[PDB]
Amino acid sequence: ELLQRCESLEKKTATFENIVCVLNREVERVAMTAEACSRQHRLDQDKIEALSSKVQQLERSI
């Protein structure tokens, strides 16, 4: 049993080196896309307020 039970544990642990390399790669990339939206949400929240202050004057002068 043992020699077989460690041989399939070390075979399984061999596979995990690249499983974890993948999982990390994946998350790195999702830490990126979600970093972008957090920046592009401030680009759509400030430029949307700034033109709100503009129409506020255009309709005021009418």
Rounded to whole angstroms, the Cα distance separating 60 from 12 reads 71
Q: What DSSP state is assigned to residue 62?
A: -
Residue located via tokens 């949400």 = 41
Judged by CB under 8 A, does residue 48 bind a copy of itself?
A: yes
Q: Which amino acid is at 24?
A: N
Interaction of residue 59 with a copy of itself, rule CB under 8 A: yes
CA distances from 6 to 2, 30, 41, 53 (A): 6, 35, 51, 70
Binding characters for a copy of itself, 3-42, by CB under 8 A (x = yes): x-xx--xx-xx--xx-xx--xx-xx-xxx-xxxxxx-xx-
List of residues contacting a copy of itself (CB under 8 A): 1-3, 5-6, 9-10, 12-13, 16-17, 19-20, 23-24, 26-27, 29-31, 33-38, 40-41, 44-45, 47-48, 51-52, 54-55, 57-59, 61-62
